[PDB]
């Protein structure tokens, strides 16, 4: 058996630590792997003796007696957002894979200016959309209680940039408006919503 | 290098005949499986005079018959292409110099009764696979060596990995490689470094020290993993390994006085000839420790020869000091 | 060099026999095939120690495996099942006598033909309020109603693909999460300076690469055969 957190979340530039606890027959090593969304897993670190292993911003620690291992990620960047898979090498040389810890890196916004806007177009489509943008990491936006109204946050930026958090809401319904679209979302002060 | 074979002929118990070491290369003419010792030499036991043909012998040599620390070792024997009639790859495991595992027909096979009965069939299926990856990896290291020494043809590549548990509980472990029977690379797990006595071996040393994650892994296996395997098997072979069987001493004359000791376990033993009543250091033969074939062992000590002197044979097994009086005027 | 795994997408009707390639320039002994599922770690279907010899891994009912050369490792399922929907990974490495890292193949998406549909793509022009406020403009693309999930969305400005300013969802959601036959949706956001947008000479385009049926796939349906196609939407700058 092997256990590691399902999901973690941190802000860009911060430092995170992903724990891994394993029980196997013997111990022939422990591997840390990075697997981006919709991609192949790649090697990160490998540990056998008790101690630490540093490579660049990344560092890996292991305690054989406790069956514990953590992965220390310093100076988090946007490209660091992926799953981090822990797997030890057993006694026989079979390798036991645990479901990784999904890390989501929130961008660092120095001058936040949250607001909801009403978009034009499509004319190639019959649905209308709303844009919530420029909100800090302290802002939470969840799913809508409406079935006919779809909302998607957690958009992953590409690999300078114009990078800022954003969330899109859309629907077919006539009762849909940019005022009631993002209702019941956690909201700070000074954030703009249109009335009509 | 090449090592001329040492030969000895003797019977299982006093009246099966045994032809029984220390030779290299493995080319030699019931017969036991090929075995390996700590000095890279090989040894065989053929049981029913005796003729032995070897590369270090022009004319075949003829001999006639005329009358507690525990360890776990793993050996690999590689043979440069082609086969030369011998299997190219052979891997064999030993605990307390007792044969247990035997790979060459690519199968993971036990050599003991308590090995197979204590292990599920899934265990052998998993390691018979590992061995195939290990066989191929050994062949590639062999080719690489021959290209480094700049010569081709018949050459032997040997690997020995093992650990041992002292009576007091202290442990050690070791990893060594040998080319053509000579020490090639020696691994020190304390400093995580490889030792090379050759200019050619020094090449692989710089490649093998270039990989830290392999070096760190080898330390773990010897120190932690190996010992766990050791203690697992000991509990398995608690019957045969922890027993103690007393020797039966026979004395004979032909001048020369012979002293034989039959069927004793463990192999740890001490025999010396005595004269009034001191140990004689001159004109003495060691005889070494020989396998009986029962799983027991036998050895012998001889002495070539004033009046009224007492010659007697001292044997310490369980210690338990035994003495037999052979001769006097 | 590297490990190469083909194909990367496939759509199958149940009962079809299909094979998956995997090839190493890397000259290793060992070859693995994996099956990754949501919420679960990798599970080994079959492994090959050396050329010609293979062995059953953790979970291999559907799959039969052969080793041609040292370089090639084939996967196969002769009879396809809906339960065989997953993201396969091929993988080749030195033996585990360690620590010997394992190298992974770029992956193969599989699912598992009337429910197969291409995406509907549409773009939505920036808000006038956003431009006069933050001095920035944000375009929004929506790819909706596509099944199965195989999509690659990228933004195109004046014929050249852009990256900076693009925020796209990690994976698509479902339009009817209650229903199991539901199709998927995907959103994307492209942001650019206020001036850059207000210029009508600029052409913005949303591109969704879809992976559907192949050429030889039987299509008796009255509707358009849902093959591999690039569905797009465009938008012109507005002053």
XYZ file of C-alpha atoms in Angstrom, chain B:
329
model
C 45.174 -16.062 -15.099
C 44.915 -19.853 -15.085
C 44.858 -22.016 -11.952
C 45.971 -25.685 -12.020
C 43.366 -28.005 -10.443
C 43.890 -29.619 -7.040
C 42.610 -33.192 -6.878
C 41.640 -35.501 -4.015
C 40.014 -38.943 -4.048
C 38.180 -40.442 -1.087
C 35.095 -42.430 -0.054
C 31.870 -41.116 1.522
C 32.242 -43.267 4.620
C 34.972 -45.886 5.302
C 34.663 -49.440 3.860
C 30.437 -44.101 -2.517
C 33.623 -42.788 -4.163
C 34.321 -39.048 -4.469
C 36.496 -37.267 -6.990
C 36.729 -33.704 -5.727
C 38.908 -27.673 -6.700
C 40.772 -24.379 -7.007
C 40.904 -24.415 -10.794
C 40.304 -21.936 -13.626
C 39.085 -21.656 -16.451
C 35.912 -23.758 -15.877
C 36.827 -26.183 -18.688
C 37.304 -29.515 -16.987
C 37.048 -33.229 -17.496
C 27.691 -38.530 -11.390
C 28.742 -34.879 -11.367
C 27.503 -31.996 -9.229
C 26.759 -28.477 -10.414
C 29.627 -26.073 -11.102
C 30.410 -24.067 -7.971
C 32.400 -20.915 -7.156
C 34.645 -19.934 -4.269
C 35.642 -16.577 -2.811
C 38.884 -16.516 -4.814
C 37.036 -16.896 -8.149
C 38.203 -20.498 -8.607
C 35.741 -23.303 -9.353
C 35.099 -26.693 -7.718
C 33.247 -29.881 -8.653
C 32.249 -33.150 -7.024
C 32.095 -36.332 -9.054
C 30.803 -39.406 -7.214
C 30.271 -43.083 -8.062
C 41.552 -43.948 -9.829
C 40.584 -40.542 -11.244
C 41.570 -38.727 -14.452
C 41.370 -34.935 -14.710
C 42.063 -33.034 -17.922
C 42.699 -29.277 -17.835
C 44.365 -26.452 -19.795
C 47.136 -26.255 -17.194
C 47.887 -29.942 -17.716
C 49.805 -31.247 -20.729
C 49.288 -34.878 -19.805
C 46.064 -35.590 -17.867
C 46.774 -36.035 -14.145
C 45.994 -39.376 -12.514
C 45.194 -40.023 -8.863
C 44.236 -43.383 -7.369
C 42.276 -44.159 -4.223
C 44.442 -46.099 -1.791
C 43.665 -46.683 1.885
C 29.756 -19.558 13.559
C 28.995 -16.605 11.287
C 26.277 -16.983 8.665
C 26.582 -15.562 5.136
C 24.608 -15.199 1.910
C 26.471 -15.030 -1.405
C 25.447 -14.666 -5.050
C 27.797 -15.558 -7.914
C 27.697 -14.805 -11.637
C 29.835 -16.604 -14.218
C 30.086 -15.005 -17.656
C 31.616 -16.562 -20.771
C 32.589 -14.482 -23.815
C 30.952 -15.503 -27.106
C 30.548 -18.109 -28.382
C 29.398 -20.634 -25.774
C 32.513 -22.840 -25.973
C 30.331 -25.761 -24.861
C 29.740 -24.172 -21.456
C 26.624 -22.120 -20.685
C 27.486 -18.455 -21.323
C 25.741 -17.261 -18.173
C 25.425 -19.039 -14.828
C 24.171 -17.518 -11.579
C 24.189 -19.395 -8.276
C 23.355 -18.426 -4.699
C 24.889 -19.733 -1.477
C 24.032 -19.493 2.201
C 26.776 -20.875 4.466
C 28.265 -22.528 1.375
C 25.015 -24.438 0.877
C 23.676 -24.421 -2.703
C 20.197 -22.856 -3.013
C 19.437 -21.098 -6.334
C 20.691 -22.135 -9.803
C 20.250 -20.300 -13.116
C 21.904 -20.885 -16.520
C 17.506 -23.552 -20.049
C 16.490 -20.252 -18.460
C 14.856 -21.233 -15.121
C 14.905 -20.059 -11.450
C 15.540 -23.334 -9.693
C 16.102 -24.227 -6.080
C 18.905 -26.479 -4.972
C 17.595 -27.159 -1.461
C 14.477 -28.835 -0.042
C 13.671 -26.060 2.429
C 14.033 -23.502 -0.353
C 11.234 -24.772 -2.564
C 8.874 -25.845 0.210
C 9.070 -22.434 1.883
C 8.658 -20.448 -1.340
C 5.499 -19.987 -3.408
C 5.752 -20.673 -7.176
C 5.209 -16.958 -7.847
C 8.599 -16.242 -6.291
C 10.510 -18.300 -8.834
C 8.476 -16.909 -11.733
C 9.392 -13.352 -10.808
C 13.122 -13.949 -10.401
C 13.474 -16.181 -13.456
C 12.460 -13.010 -15.248
C 14.985 -10.774 -13.472
C 17.737 -13.274 -14.316
C 17.004 -13.011 -18.037
C 17.526 -9.262 -17.862
C 20.642 -9.937 -15.822
C 21.957 -12.505 -18.275
C 21.731 -10.100 -21.206
C 23.203 -7.209 -19.214
C 26.146 -9.438 -18.328
C 26.842 -10.300 -21.969
C 27.011 -6.601 -22.865
C 29.451 -5.861 -20.044
C 31.543 -8.750 -21.340
C 31.759 -7.430 -24.900
C 32.570 -3.972 -23.545
C 35.487 -5.397 -21.561
C 37.007 -7.345 -24.445
C 36.949 -4.132 -26.495
C 38.698 -2.340 -23.629
C 41.433 -4.936 -23.153
C 41.724 -4.980 -26.953
C 41.460 -8.762 -27.337
C 38.885 -11.358 -28.388
C 38.189 -15.042 -27.919
C 37.698 -17.045 -24.737
C 37.483 -14.956 -21.559
C 35.582 -15.271 -18.257
C 33.690 -12.560 -16.358
C 32.779 -13.126 -12.715
C 30.542 -11.322 -10.228
C 30.218 -11.945 -6.499
C 27.817 -10.101 -4.252
C 27.074 -11.086 -0.675
C 26.786 -10.262 3.002
C 27.468 -12.026 6.285
C 26.010 -11.911 9.792
C 28.561 -12.374 12.580
C 27.783 -14.494 15.647
C 27.628 -11.296 17.697
C 25.202 -9.592 15.313
C 27.634 -7.390 13.380
C 27.275 -7.325 9.590
C 29.368 -6.756 6.458
C 28.682 -6.753 2.722
C 30.698 -6.881 -0.485
C 30.539 -6.481 -4.268
C 33.377 -7.713 -6.478
C 33.988 -8.306 -10.184
C 36.707 -10.464 -11.734
C 38.014 -10.742 -15.294
C 39.609 -14.044 -16.348
C 39.690 -15.045 -12.689
C 41.744 -12.072 -11.519
C 40.267 -9.388 -9.244
C 38.924 -6.604 -11.448
C 36.758 -4.177 -9.454
C 36.166 -4.062 -5.698
C 33.395 -2.033 -4.080
C 33.636 -0.300 -0.723
C 30.146 0.503 0.579
C 31.437 2.673 3.410
C 33.020 5.336 1.195
C 30.821 4.624 -1.853
C 33.750 4.072 -4.204
C 35.145 1.449 -6.555
C 38.692 0.138 -6.321
C 40.615 -0.690 -9.507
C 44.009 -2.409 -9.686
C 44.178 -2.210 -13.471
C 44.539 0.645 -15.952
C 41.705 -0.914 -17.964
C 39.478 -1.518 -14.940
C 39.997 2.142 -14.033
C 37.862 3.075 -17.046
C 34.780 1.297 -15.726
C 35.548 2.699 -12.277
C 35.155 6.227 -13.646
C 31.889 5.244 -15.336
C 30.541 3.447 -12.269
C 31.417 6.259 -9.876
C 29.796 8.673 -12.324
C 26.442 7.182 -11.314
C 25.693 8.115 -7.706
C 22.202 6.607 -7.581
C 23.626 3.166 -8.381
C 26.336 3.504 -5.710
C 23.803 4.621 -3.084
C 21.537 1.737 -4.043
C 24.278 -0.893 -3.689
C 24.931 0.264 -0.125
C 21.286 -0.173 0.836
C 20.955 -3.669 -0.633
C 24.016 -5.087 1.087
C 23.324 -3.452 4.460
C 19.550 -3.728 4.623
C 18.041 -5.913 1.893
C 20.634 -8.735 1.838
C 20.532 -9.340 5.595
C 16.737 -9.583 5.559
C 16.994 -12.257 2.888
C 19.693 -13.966 4.945
C 17.572 -14.209 8.106
C 14.518 -15.270 6.098
C 16.378 -18.297 4.718
C 18.015 -19.172 8.029
C 14.612 -19.535 9.657
C 13.745 -21.697 6.657
C 16.794 -23.938 6.963
C 16.810 -23.886 10.758
C 16.829 -27.683 10.626
C 19.900 -28.406 8.507
C 21.935 -25.274 9.205
C 21.830 -25.255 13.013
C 22.548 -28.968 13.521
C 25.809 -30.432 14.831
C 27.053 -33.893 13.845
C 30.196 -35.370 15.486
C 33.167 -36.686 13.468
C 34.241 -40.330 13.380
C 38.038 -40.486 13.538
C 40.071 -43.195 11.792
C 43.862 -43.553 11.891
C 46.094 -45.456 9.431
C 49.703 -46.155 8.442
C 51.560 -46.856 5.186
C 56.982 -43.537 7.655
C 53.601 -41.841 7.136
C 50.605 -41.755 9.479
C 47.146 -40.797 8.224
C 44.339 -39.265 10.273
C 40.801 -39.188 8.836
C 37.641 -37.599 10.253
C 34.304 -38.531 8.691
C 30.904 -36.857 8.523
C 31.051 -33.713 10.632
C 29.002 -30.512 10.560
C 29.604 -27.542 10.660
C 32.713 -27.450 8.379
C 34.567 -25.492 11.092
C 37.109 -27.962 12.450
C 40.726 -28.305 13.581
C 43.058 -31.298 13.222
C 46.744 -31.637 14.077
C 49.238 -34.421 14.850
C 50.814 -34.586 18.296
C 54.147 -35.840 19.615
C 54.648 -36.134 23.385
C 52.285 -34.376 23.277
C 53.161 -31.336 21.187
C 51.810 -30.334 17.787
C 54.179 -31.183 14.930
C 54.753 -28.357 12.456
C 57.114 -30.297 10.205
C 56.328 -32.859 7.490
C 52.589 -32.234 7.739
C 49.777 -32.116 5.183
C 46.692 -29.935 5.642
C 44.205 -31.939 3.576
C 41.646 -29.113 3.598
C 37.883 -29.407 4.123
C 36.124 -31.834 1.792
C 32.409 -32.489 1.126
C 31.196 -35.938 2.140
C 28.135 -35.954 -0.099
C 25.691 -36.391 2.775
C 25.760 -32.676 3.407
C 28.458 -33.523 5.930
C 32.206 -33.059 5.600
C 35.509 -34.889 6.077
C 39.206 -33.946 6.344
C 42.618 -35.512 6.928
C 46.084 -34.756 8.328
C 49.248 -36.779 7.680
C 52.747 -36.849 9.187
C 55.953 -38.510 7.966
C 58.277 -39.977 10.616
C 63.645 -41.625 18.798
C 61.957 -44.591 20.500
C 59.018 -44.602 22.911
C 57.425 -41.535 21.337
C 53.642 -41.174 21.300
C 51.963 -40.005 18.111
C 48.312 -39.063 18.577
C 45.599 -37.258 16.588
C 43.908 -34.157 18.026
C 40.482 -33.130 16.743
C 38.332 -30.233 17.934
C 34.802 -30.033 16.528
C 32.175 -28.920 19.032
C 35.221 -28.267 21.176
C 34.905 -30.954 22.524
C 38.600 -31.740 22.086
C 39.069 -35.278 20.824
C 42.311 -37.236 20.834
C 43.137 -40.626 19.344
C 46.436 -42.400 20.090
C 47.936 -43.641 16.837
C 51.418 -44.997 17.514
C 54.242 -45.785 19.971
C 57.196 -48.196 20.335
